[PDB]
Design an enzyme around this catalytic site. Structure first.
Site, PDB file in Angstrom:
ATOM      1  N   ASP A  15       0.818  -1.305   0.015  1.00 20.33           N
ATOM      2  CA  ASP A  15       0.036  -0.050   0.037  1.00 20.33           C
ATOM      3  C   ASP A  15       0.822   1.241  -0.091  1.00 20.33           C
ATOM      4  O   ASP A  15       0.154   2.260   0.249  1.00 20.33           O
ATOM      5  CB  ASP A  15      -1.038  -0.032   1.146  1.00 20.33           C
ATOM      6  N   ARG A  29       1.059   6.880   0.173  1.00 12.37           N
ATOM      7  CA  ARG A  29       0.447   5.719   0.794  1.00 12.37           C
ATOM      8  C   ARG A  29      -1.319   5.731   0.106  1.00 12.37           C
ATOM      9  O   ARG A  29      -2.026   6.777   0.122  1.00 12.37           O
ATOM     10  CB  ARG A  29       0.239   6.321   2.316  1.00 12.37           C
ATOM     11  N   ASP A  34      -5.711  -1.197   3.540  1.00 10.87           N
ATOM     12  CA  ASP A  34      -4.622  -1.613   4.409  1.00 10.87           C
ATOM     13  C   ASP A  34      -4.126  -3.033   4.000  1.00 10.87           C
ATOM     14  O   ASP A  34      -4.947  -3.793   4.087  1.00 10.87           O
ATOM     15  CB  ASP A  34      -5.273  -1.844   5.913  1.00 10.87           C
ATOM     16  N   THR A  35      -3.046  -2.883   3.363  1.00 12.76           N
ATOM     17  CA  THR A  35      -2.339  -4.137   3.224  1.00 12.76           C
ATOM     18  C   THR A  35      -1.589  -4.820   4.456  1.00 12.76           C
ATOM     19  O   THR A  35      -1.023  -3.968   5.079  1.00 12.76           O
ATOM     20  CB  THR A  35      -1.272  -4.226   1.858  1.00 12.76           C
ATOM     21  N   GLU A  37       1.648  -6.149   6.451  1.00 17.41           N
ATOM     22  CA  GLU A  37       3.238  -5.432   6.372  1.00 17.41           C
ATOM     23  C   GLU A  37       3.836  -6.982   5.655  1.00 17.41           C
ATOM     24  O   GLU A  37       3.353  -7.805   5.476  1.00 17.41           O
ATOM     25  CB  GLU A  37       3.726  -5.229   7.649  1.00 17.41           C
ATOM     26  N   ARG A  75       3.681  11.174   3.732  1.00 17.12           N
ATOM     27  CA  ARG A  75       3.382  10.592   2.636  1.00 17.12           C
ATOM     28  C   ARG A  75       1.845  11.231   1.878  1.00 17.12           C
ATOM     29  O   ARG A  75       0.948  11.704   2.575  1.00 17.12           O
ATOM     30  CB  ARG A  75       2.996   9.014   3.015  1.00 17.12           C
TER      31      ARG A  75
HETATM   32  C1  THP Z   1      -4.253   5.622   5.013  1.00 13.35           C
HETATM   33  C2  THP Z   1      -3.975   6.593   6.108  1.00 13.35           C
HETATM   34  C3  THP Z   1      -2.927   6.524   7.101  1.00 13.35           C
HETATM   35  N1  THP Z   1      -2.746   7.551   7.952  1.00 13.35           N
HETATM   36  C4  THP Z   1      -1.887   7.101   9.124  1.00 13.35           C
HETATM   37  C5  THP Z   1      -2.820   6.699   9.985  1.00 13.35           C
HETATM   38  C6  THP Z   1      -1.804   5.340  10.981  1.00 13.35           C
HETATM   39  O1  THP Z   1      -1.132   6.290  12.061  1.00 13.35           O
HETATM   40  P1  THP Z   1      -0.072   5.401  12.933  1.00 13.35           P
HETATM   41  O2  THP Z   1       1.151   5.138  12.168  1.00 13.35           O
HETATM   42  O3  THP Z   1       0.020   6.259  14.213  1.00 13.35           O
HETATM   43  O4  THP Z   1      -0.799   3.943  13.229  1.00 13.35           O
HETATM   44  C7  THP Z   1      -0.896   5.034   9.782  1.00 13.35           C
HETATM   45  C8  THP Z   1      -1.159   3.772   9.202  1.00 13.35           C
HETATM   46  O5  THP Z   1      -0.323   3.662   7.997  1.00 13.35           O
HETATM   47  P2  THP Z   1       0.240   2.376   7.657  1.00 13.35           P
HETATM   48  O6  THP Z   1      -0.793   1.387   7.551  1.00 13.35           O
HETATM   49  O7  THP Z   1       1.224   2.515   6.320  1.00 13.35           O
HETATM   50  O8  THP Z   1       1.031   1.929   8.770  1.00 13.35           O
HETATM   51  O9  THP Z   1      -0.850   6.147   8.740  1.00 13.35           O
HETATM   52  C9  THP Z   1      -3.323   8.698   7.936  1.00 13.35           C
HETATM   53  O10 THP Z   1      -3.265   9.428   8.701  1.00 13.35           O
HETATM   54  N2  THP Z   1      -4.303   8.895   6.865  1.00 13.35           N
HETATM   55  C10 THP Z   1      -4.460   7.789   5.980  1.00 13.35           C
HETATM   56  O11 THP Z   1      -5.208   8.304   5.092  1.00 13.35           O
HETATM   57 CA    CA Z   2      -0.242  -1.439   5.674  1.00 11.51          CA
END
Ligand code: THP
Ligand code: CA
Length: 129
Positions: A15, A29, A34-35, A37, A75
């Site tokens: 993702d 991103r 959510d893929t 890891e 991102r």
């Molecule tokens: C997809 C997405 C993720 N995020 C943030 C939320 C999560 O914060 P946290 O890192 O504190 O968990 C994290 C999840 O991304 P990842 O799934 O790439 O880890 O990215 C956003 O803020 N907006 C979004 O649209």
């Molecule tokens: Ca992920």
């Protein structure tokens, strides 16, 4: 919403992908998904799926939603398209991502992706197997 140009710099995982956008390198991103890891079950399959889709594409485009365009990690938050096909949707349709992270005001394609998740679940694909 509208599509804008970008070019692949490098696949990262299911993702996230590194694209050049308005001439600058950025990690994107994918919105609304959510893929797993890489270290998780179906992670390597998700990474491969996104890598192949992005690398095989003659034309990559990104589409920002109405709300935030970058997350707290810097991102870019977008829907990505490979030759017109949305990567976010395709991952969900194949059971390689769940619909996730649906924030108010960046959720234009939510119901399209939920419909794909339903079909992947019905088919018991991958993460739904
Ligand atoms: C997809 C997405 C993720 N995020 C943030 C939320 C999560 O914060 P946290 O890192 O504190 O968990 C994290 C999840 O991304 P990842 O799934 O790439 O880890 O990215 C956003 O803020 N907006 C979004 O649209
Ligand atoms: Ca992920």
């Amino acid at each position: 919403l509208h599509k804008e140009p970008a070019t692949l710099i490098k696949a990262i995982d299911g993702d996230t992908v590194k694209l050049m956008y308005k001439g600058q390198p950025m990690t994107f991103r994918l919105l609304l998904v959510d893929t797993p890891e890489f270290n998780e079950k179906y992670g390597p399959e998700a990474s491969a799926f996104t890598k192949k889709m992005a690398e095989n594409a003659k034309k990559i485009e990104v589409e920002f939603d109405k709300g935030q365009r970058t997350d707290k990690y810097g991102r870019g938050l977008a829907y990505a398209y490979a030759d017109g096909k949305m990567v976010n949707e395709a991952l969900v349709r194949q059971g390689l991502a769940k619909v996730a992270y649906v924030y108010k005001g960046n959720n234009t394609h939510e119901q399209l992706l939920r419909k794909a998740e339903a079909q992947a679940k019905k088919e018991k694909l991958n993460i739904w197997s």
